[model samples]
Target: TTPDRVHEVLGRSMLVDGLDIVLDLTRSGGSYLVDAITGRRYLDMFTFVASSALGMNPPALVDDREFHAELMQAALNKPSNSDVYSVAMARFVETFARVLGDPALPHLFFVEGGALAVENALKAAFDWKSRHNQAHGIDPALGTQVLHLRGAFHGRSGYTLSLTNTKPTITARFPKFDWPRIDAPYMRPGLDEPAMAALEAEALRQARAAFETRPHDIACFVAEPIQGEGGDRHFRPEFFAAMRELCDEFDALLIFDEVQTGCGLTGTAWAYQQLDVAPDIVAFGKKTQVCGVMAGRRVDEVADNVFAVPSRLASTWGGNLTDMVRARRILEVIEAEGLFERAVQHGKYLRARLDELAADFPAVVLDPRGRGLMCAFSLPTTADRDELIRQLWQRAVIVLPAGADTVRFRPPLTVSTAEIDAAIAAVRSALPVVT
Candidate 1:
């Protein structure tokens, strides 16, 4: 039913040529999905680009009598930026701030999507710095530009398109922000550890140069701990620690765009937790049910400042009663159910299988890289990669492709060891045909 009229109804945007399956989804049970139109079941490896981390239609969420009742009660009330929704907003903010592991980031701002969250983060940094500058009687722009890394995939918003380096996809013909774009230190194998570390330092030095170019003008430096969309890329933790110091030296805020790396998707509450670097502003979305940022004034010593002024930044759907209630429940379930530890163990097992495949098919499987279930392996060519995806779809598996020739695996947190084995078997079978 869906496939027959998909192109005409949905338009050509964001569609893959052969692998974009349009099966009508009737229901999802844990990590698998049942297709009503095709009468087939699929091991859901992609999980809606990693959004459904707790697994699809988990009974705890759908079957909860309390949640159902509250949602109904909340729905009867008109949605507002103020008044009745305030209690829900405060409750969500408290839990979210606690889980993110900081009180210095006392200001919790809300939004409805990752792009808008990123957009809001940028605005907050500007306002925070802009106000501080005004207090000091200095020009903010003279000391408040933004820096982001190359190969970043922050969002698809017009302003964030400027922040991203997806290139030719959404960035082409768009007006990009004149922010300092630096190369992220992605350590590839075959290089000596010392050489790789030195290269990483050079990248840091390049960032320092950018900051020193105008000194105080750079307001914030945005980064992703794991570059999920820019191909599943990882770097040493020390690199981020250095980024923290660099931001501190320049008096700039360091924002972690954990939209893809947070919400227990990376086997940690926040990816920065693993990196050992605290984000001044942590913007998360996609899997959060509701999108938001936990922000702090960038400083060494706490001084009472009006960096966070109410209504300086606001959104209609942000902290809405509906999403706030849902977001809070999602976090509670993830923590109480031990899904974080499950993700860690399952990711270890699954990644080992991918490594074995990389060894088995040396020509095709280039490199298997990820931290936890947020995983992907590269193919030699885009043709091989896309064809492998199509082949996997035919064999009752769903997946997502990342930058260039990488096949990303974003399976649910509750995916079993048996399901992992099946996914590997599907990959093993598809590779021989596609490669």
Candidate 2:
């Protein structure tokens, strides 16, 4: 009755037309045992859409008395002037700078979530490209277009909406801007080496053509390190390196959206580091208390840097002090518990088990893809995927759908081997029925 009443109220007063399941999340702790309003216990495999990277009720976040007091007092007080802001900024930057993997990317700006972060990064990239053209004796007006790969979802913002091409349901009714987009290179298991090379070469040619086709008009090229919503798709490291070179040649900024793959999900602080290359800007959110954009110096010389005008981009409550402190604390917990390396180890074990299951149910399971705990497996069809989700929920496991015909596994970093085994058993049991 409570759930029904709540849904009724929401329907009457709100515009939540896409609301699915009115599970009132009551209590959750560790990697399991999330209590629902109906007094049911779920394994919480989805980890609240992969936001709680460390785990629910993390001791470091919940038990630290002194830190809690300090954070509380800061929150109670009014936001400070330049002095208070400076101290908090230095504390946050010093901790974050270590994991950024490149000293050239010294600048950092914060937002409340991934959407705002990408939107700001887009603005900075455009302004930077405009300034670059200005210095090179080209018209700044030429720096107008931004390129995104197909099946990418930056967010739901007006500007960010232009970058997304994943689903019609999300983009429906919203007017799309005229932005240049390239098809993401598709790779699958058992793809031969010669075929892989040919596909990559052609994809690179197409990407390069987008930049070259409109000289000085393209402002930036953006892509996700891993396409989270697009069926967990992946591209090779070499292709990303090639993209970096092309952006350099065309004097365009390259931006990597690490909103899904960041926070050690892909066994690195930033997924792009795995490719041995760096982008001009990175947009990150989800696990952090505040989403943020990290930018690199445009060129060696500062005379032509678009970032020279920092005032051009500003958001109200963008750099909240309390959020910065929370982010720092989250980083500390990840380091103190060695969550990053553990995710790598657990990912290996989980993927191995999933691969075996895929073989066992080859008719139903198509491919299992992932790195670290960011794992997913495709089914034969979307109907199969939806039914499997229902069966998993009936078995007291919670998971989320990804792409068109796949389910993603986003267990917390603290999930145990026993729990992984249990999840596998449940998935195997659900397979035949879904088929």
Candidate 3:
């Protein structure tokens, strides 16, 4: 009966559409396609919110079972609490230097997950801001606020939630835009000149003003490298270059929340890697298997300037032994399998098809843009967007939605050509009836 899908029958009855091939995944390496309803077998495009870094249970990680066994044993023994020094955890963190291809920041703080990581980042940025002003004989009571885009989703943590300046639709429940929530240029009906310029002017002005304004100079500017939850919102390279400089000018740190964009979803190893400028700290989760905040020099410097060694920001299970092993193994396997390559290739194919659809059905489909495998196609109306998703599901494609009126295709980095074809066929079949 396979796993997760022990509820299915045989033959054509197994799947509704009377599909082409069974795919019949016997075994997997961080990759598996199980039946959705019956838990038998269907293709897994979106790898657990885009996790599944290495694709199924890959060969490289055949020994990972042994690794897990080792971790389980370690947990049972709990290593000696009598021992004060823990080098394994330290070494694990230091290994990040190799992956990031940067100088060692030496310090790292692990959290329960992305939300906690975000909470830590916010605290660090604000704490840093306070210390910064105080050192200059400025008031400590007043510190910079955090800035996020209009449709940003940093995290669900209250501090991060506040920073997530998205739209009224998403941010309405939260007390957001309490500080400075700048509007990133979202060009309508394809890129327009006057509207874009005006939006850019407003955004730039807000950011610049926040960089210097009292109690709102912005503790930090937070955003996803690619707005995963905010419908893949992306700004031009020039915009980030300007942002980096602006942050530098005001002595504010640039913090990028790459929780969704990291783990090789984007062509770059990390989505921030594509950005021309370096962030003060890059927070990642999603496909990481385990989550932690990657601190940059500036964030570290801020910590040193502000907090006592132990008093600085921290958490309990941020980089615990078991999760560290999983995170490390995940990184190694992603590299070996060339899944990043697969992601870009598959994403390109998906985008091209969506582009073709958009051209033919202008009203039904609008912008269809993405980098790597993180792609989306928008509808002119939210109603159409809902219908498209429902239709895709009925066709057994299992696509998701994002932003406003946008149908997102954030498949895992390992989706194959046949899978995309199946999705396209599904979309094609659904289009006529859904519209």
Each prediction's Cα lDDT score? 0.79, 0.79, 0.67
**Poorest 10 consecutive residues of model 1 by lDDT?**
299-308
Give per-residue CA lDDT, model 2, range 25-48, as digits (tens).
436567665445455667777876
User: Sorted by lDDT, highest first, which candidate order results?
Assistant: 1, 2, 3
Clashing pairs in 1: 143-216, 143-217, 144-217, 145-217, 145-218
TM-score of 3: 0.83
lDDT at 49, model 2: 76
Q: Between prediction 1 and prediction 3, which has the larger TM-score? A: 1
lDDT of model 2 at position 395: 91
Query: For model 3, what is the error of residue 326's alpha carbon versus the real structure, in angstroms, after optimal superposition?
Result: 1.8
| lDDT at position 217, candidate 2 | 88
Instruction: Please give the range of 10 consecutive residues that has the lowest summed lDDT in model 3.
Output: 76-85
**Steric clashes per prediction:** 5, 1, 22
TM-scores for all predictions: 0.91, 0.92, 0.83
What is candidate 1's lDDT per residue for 105-181, written digit by digit as tens?
77666667889888888877776666666667777556447898889999989668877886577778778768888
The segments of candidate 2 whose C-alpha lies over 4 angstroms from its true place after superposition are 1-5, 15-26, 74-90, 99-101, 297-306
Ranking by TM-score: 2, 1, 3
RMSD in order of candidates: 2.8, 2.5, 5.8
